[model samples]
Target: IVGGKDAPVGKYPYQVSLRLSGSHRCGASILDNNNVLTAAHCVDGLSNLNRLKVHVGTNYLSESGDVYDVEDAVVNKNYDDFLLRNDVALVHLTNPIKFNDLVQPIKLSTNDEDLESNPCTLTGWGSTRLGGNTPNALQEIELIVHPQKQCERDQWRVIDSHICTLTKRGEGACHGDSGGPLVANGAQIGIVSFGSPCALGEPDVYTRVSSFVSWINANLKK
Candidate 1:
């Protein structure tokens, strides 16, 4: 998959799996050893948090490592289910993980400086089409960061904190990629937010990582 500079040979060592009702769906990322970042919409309107199961390991099908029962998850305070503005949340594992190359977490970006005009990568078991099935193996691709002005033209509110990226030629963030990471410069710069009709040259939106730096540190630190 797409690995950053800091995401050493075995770093980003966890592949998170989400088990929804009938489907053993997959999405989300564990950016830090203790903090798991995901789309707020994923946990939205869940009457029973107990039903959701999170598995962390290098492989998807096999449970070779830790499988955690989520104690509690916190969505961004500004998260709006309708507009999808603050589309991020955290899954707090009952226990923190020990660092290793394959299981270690990547650092978060501090600003949008290096992000613009740079190439980044996103990975997921997400489908290549809308309303389609997810692949068994992970897929990744390089994307160029689109400027705020261009993103705003596509009906995305280009906030100073928001970062947008587009596929140069073929494919982009599809339906099942929700909550996956948009990695760049050895850190995560965005999360798979959403897009229309799946890879139609329409820009795919992402949750701006730099926007919520303060919130991430505050919640993740403790």
Candidate 2:
């Protein structure tokens, strides 16, 4: 899914990059006009919200353009610090994005039930190897949904409202990829929630977007 017609990463131009001053573990996603969706933990320690900057469209750091200040953000209320539950966030951009092929809004999941048996895609500039290399251009991978019972048996019993996906041949989500997208059917159904390390055999965890439709709708309405 990295760079083909079915590839999900290259389809959008308005992807975001979440970062602090000296950290590279942050994750990101495409923008919806004046807002960006990402993992809540990326902003959880922000006593000063202004410390973060959202870079949209371009992937490179030099000319990504439009480093907007974060005006306000809403982290999920049910975000459990112990288990990392409901780790999603919506950030309001200081200004609206000017749409283009590389900077357009991606569709949200329109059908909740589709997640039960769907294969999904995730992409990021996160590390390709454990402590090895972070990609230059963004990378993409495909995974199939893991059954709940199987997921629980795999040491993820706390995964109530989460969806699980794993790459074939033991390749999948890893560290430094948190908050990246889990896309299905041209829409987003999950975000990179957690995993043991990057690209381990364990199933990758995701924040279930369908389970928080009300929260998303409420925030988007504002």
Candidate 3:
């Protein structure tokens, strides 16, 4: 998170610090008691799934308010790693999560109309800047949505299923932020997917959650 502020306590209750071997790998969003949402890139091709873990309900990276083991994981069948299209994934937990003031599930918007009217927010414990250290405390930044055309210029060829955000140079998501939620009025409309590193002025791309609503609903149990 470049130019992001430390997240206030008791906020972003559904946030998940997706970890691998006890280190922060990416940010994730809780979808329900048994399913968590994240970018396919974050969970794809792990040699040992047991090494994957999720630490939730805490703003601090060091605290495991509730740590859960992995049962299984699935990525979009159409997921393209190079293009980063359909980059979302669903993580199944070994056990159901019990919600608290700092833990909860969020609903998604199948359309962005309502979300477009509200400012979007990104949260994570990602690096504060390019090549910088990953902070222990989660950070957050507010962003503005950019039209598809603006995000698909020469620098990027974003597909229809992708959404994007643009802000002044030095203000955007960085490493460790992937798979996080782009929240608008409590509805998750985007999953942190890719970008040109930390807020370098180019639009940061996201996997549009609305584009795969049917897939998500269909995989709620399977």
How far in Å is the alpha carbon of 119 misplaced in model 3? 1.8
Please estimate how well model 1 matches the true structure, expressed as its whole-model Cα lDDT: 0.69
Clashes of 3: 0
RMSD of each: 3.7, 3.1, 1.3
What is candidate 3's lDDT per residue for 72-160, written digit by digit as tens?
99888999897778998999998999999999998997767744424799899989999999999999899988767667782566988
Q: Which is the winner by lDDT between candidate 1 and candidate 3? A: 3
Ranking by lDDT: 3, 2, 1
CA lDDT scores, all candidates in order: 0.69, 0.69, 0.88
Task: TM-score for candidate 2, please give it.
Answer: 0.86
lDDT of 2 by residue, 146-193 (tens): 876777787555466787876553477656678877788878888777
Summarize candidate 1's per-residue lDDT along 151-181 as a digit string, tens digits.
Answer: 8887456465556777643467776678888
Please give the range of 10 consecutive residues that has the lowest summed lDDT in model 3: 110-119
Misplaced by over 4 Å in model 1 are: 1-15, 21-26, 61-65, 156-158
TM-score computed on alpha carbons, candidate 3: 0.96
Model 2, residue 51: displacement in angstroms? Answer: 2.2
lDDT of 2 at 200: 60
